[model samples]
Target: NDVFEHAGARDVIRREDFAKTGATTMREVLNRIPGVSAPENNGTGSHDLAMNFGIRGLNPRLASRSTVLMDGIPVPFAPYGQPQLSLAPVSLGNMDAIDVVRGGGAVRYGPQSVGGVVNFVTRAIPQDFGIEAGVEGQLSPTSSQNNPKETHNLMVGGTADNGFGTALLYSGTRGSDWREHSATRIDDLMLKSKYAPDEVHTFNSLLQYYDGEADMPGGLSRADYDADRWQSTRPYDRFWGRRKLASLGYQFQPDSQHKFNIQGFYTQTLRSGYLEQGKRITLSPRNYWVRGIEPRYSQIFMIGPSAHEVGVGYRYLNESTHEMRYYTATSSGQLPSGSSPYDRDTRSGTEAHAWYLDDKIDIGNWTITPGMRFEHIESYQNNAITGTHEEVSYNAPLPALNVLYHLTDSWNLYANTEGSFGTVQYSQIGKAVQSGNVEPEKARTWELGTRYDDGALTAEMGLFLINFNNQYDSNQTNDTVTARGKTRHTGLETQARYDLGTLTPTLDNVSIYASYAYVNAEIREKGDTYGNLVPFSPKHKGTLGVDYKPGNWTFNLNSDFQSSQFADNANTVKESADGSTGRIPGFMLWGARVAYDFGPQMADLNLAFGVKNIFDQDYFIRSYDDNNKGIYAGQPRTLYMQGSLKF
Candidate 1:
């Protein structure tokens, strides 16, 4: 009766693709998803900027509506729905698999299940020892910049007959600057270990670290342009961030009919940045930390002639963040002055607890699941100016139901109706809420889909409709007489994979894969001159790929496509001056990989090459106002190549 009984483990790609793309960061690898998008680091000159994975052109900020799990542990910071993918330095070489569940049946994970989940499962130690390594490079078309990005990765692990296990890994990368006028570099490390005292109990631990340095390309206003002079005078803009993460977990099987699990984790981050804007300088420093714990148990029982499974779980999370800013004048050597750095300090925190219960029942031809979750959240912020603290708390009971009916031995139909909520992160509330009071945003979704699977060929298609309320937009402010607006999103998705083992002669060992998604998202409220189309959501997106293996050779090719989209939420002509209405042109990217295995114990070698924006199409994936006047540009076409070895 497991809801995921029909899903396959190989449907998604793992982190190793990160090196294949010649991308020094996670965002680059993630952008391969047709419907997902990440903003280009125009001002910061840091291509490692965070990315948001969405379906049907949903707002990146809506990523909070999804869930992300590393290994079996839930990431503690689900406040905005977007899990920070950059925090974990785990390499794809050491990963077992990555699974992406789309649509709303993810309620079993928790309250933020509307968008689905991205789960990164680490590899378990095998019975034999192994080692692996790789390197990659790239080039950009616009800047003619040597987009050389490279990675050096290695791992070794093995297991014993007594169920004991151990593993060690090291991965690092260095890359040319992503900006025309700056230099950027990345360095990261990850370590993991696990132990299992027989089949009934297991324990795991992980530690990760990352360091990156990049220049800041200052924003500019049209009025400041000088035909013969460069726009910015600042020589270098610097930024740095560090993260520490740890997790502890235990699993037990009391009997054939029952199981228990307990887990806990802690994460901390420190960050700082310097900004230079025409005769003005600003410095910002920030720190964030989080801790979480979860415990659960499940039981299997017989109902009449059918079997059923029931489970209950409880989870707790706590998070805190502090940020400080300082401004100084650089003109006329006036020894720039502004508010004291301490005066700009902002502090915020949140504590939340939730309990959930679910049941799965299997009948002769159908399987059904019903679940409910109750969550309570308390958030507080300290106002540096008023010297006053603001606090808000709310509780919600969310419900969900799903069903799968077998149409044939290899076909099934499924449907799900669920509701989800998003809580404001303590740090975000401190800056956006004047009264230090904020309510959770809510969303409800309905999905219907069908799947066909026979091991050799698998396919699925689904349609969904979602309504959201209490959505927040930080860039805009309503008049004293107006209320903020809500938003809605509706979409459809199709995915299919076919194995050609019995079809072609030389290509008999080939497999083909493809996926497509369409979304219609918009803000729907009175007094809104903006049309319903939500900014950034592309109406159409898709991907096509081929994988082949023959004797000692393996080859793969993948292509991704995205449709044009609006750059601003207002959807107004006035805001179109920055080419916002011109439609960020749609583009397609292509990538290919080839590998050879010498022998079972010798070594396996691989080589890969790719052209992002294959047609060298000029486009803007995102845009923002600079100095209240000019609009910045997004990434252009880029090329990459890499090689790897395994022993």
Candidate 2:
């Protein structure tokens, strides 16, 4: 009910809605939602942890421009460098629903809320004795590496009347990618539990572990990509990552109008990479540990004839990391045990605090909300090789405001505006200190929109503008990357879901939907690149689909569209030997699915079959820059089937 209760512009995707469409990855599921700007990749598949997503032209690489949550909890691997998305608690099999807030008002989520937030919510422990299980698998085409067959998820859950319940999840993806010798395999295990005493108190906890090894499908030159899109130019290029997360939460509710909750979470990760595509075999393995606690309170009551809901929260985060950079003649050689022969060895520590207040006032036919938040951070870095010790501190005060006016029972209008901040990452801090800087990027957004909901149709439209200074942009050179700029992003988005069945008796149980967005993101005040369109940001994109039930058989069709976009800050289309410039052509992708359900026993004996890229049209998605780091071709046709059993 809260999905529509809030004035914020948001979209909810249920697991059934996506799994039925044969979506195996989070990226594939998000592609159907408007504003997410999920694009296709070459052989890596959109279903992995490394896929990119563009939101109003924000940096899709690191997900630095937005905040992501698992059941409303932070899931940062580093929060300041490469976000270890591979370890997020969310999964296709584990999600009950995905909540995406585009016109974010005042989320208590944290400082990473520049563009918006994506929250992955899972099903609560069952109240009754029951058991459930599900499995899905897909087969790749014959065109690429190893013709990798993919099976992404397996899950089982059970609960009894003893006030306790548990769930188990298994997920894996193993296969060769678009290029030869490029193999990627990731497997994960998760455990979830809940315990509720007689009354008033509730406890829940999650434990997840991940292990993955990926062979880098090194970038290709224009001539190389054109000659045999499947060619692998480098050997002995690979990386391995091991990570884990453990969290425990407790909630106390003494009355209907007041409640308090506290949560503690810890994560540890070790990622090592060896790149052989460049001049030499560069070796680096980063190890880090992060832990934090959050305390939250909420109260709902009447204030001067208006119903008010107020909430406040505080968070503390501590992190430490050790990293060493070295080069070797052979890619398989290990670094010295004592750190000898290593060029760079660094140790870093960070402490951060965050607090926020969220309040909502509801008057007759109208509602208003105002929110405030602040974040402060201090970090220290010690370069063992360079003998340099640097210290930096920064703080931000974020603000938010929103209003909603009801025009009629079926229509309402809303407005939202907010200012947010981005924190410095571990890798970026060293560069900042060298540049004599210690400030984080600041950004604000303004949006106006309307929602229409009736028994037969649901629709939403909005216009938005965002401006920011100190936005971070990185470029790839021979062996280094430089950060540069200021940026402006403006866009219009529309979404509608209609029941065609209402128009005709024969069309009953049929639905049609459209989700489209137009964005104009540009570099506002960057050196020489001013007035240029943001790289990899498409001007037009959307998804359209329809579903129909013909007797006991259900048929569905969907398509995604994207306009051509530049691959370089300067909008250069010509290719260069250094992979500095190029263009990514846009195209429309189509998919279809069919499912049959047994008429009895509450949807028992149901089976679904689906095919992605039904037309097999060839295309390539752009990397964030004109560099080879981000470019990859779209995948060919793939087929999948799913089955679920509940008791």
**lDDT tens digits, residues 355-400, model 1?**
8887887898877878888888887777777778877677878997
Q: How do all models score by TM-score?
A: 0.86, 0.92
| Residue pairs with backbone overlap in model 1 | 16-92, 57-537, 63-81, 64-80, 64-81, 64-82, 329-336
Best by lDDT: 2
Write down the lDDT that model 2 would get.
0.71
lDDT of 2 by residue, 69-134 (tens): 777666666664444352333455667777777765455776767657877776555555455566
TM-score of 1: 0.86
RMSD of each: 4.4, 2.9
Model 2, residue 115: C-alpha shift (Å): 2.9
Worst 10 residues of 2 by lDDT: 40-49
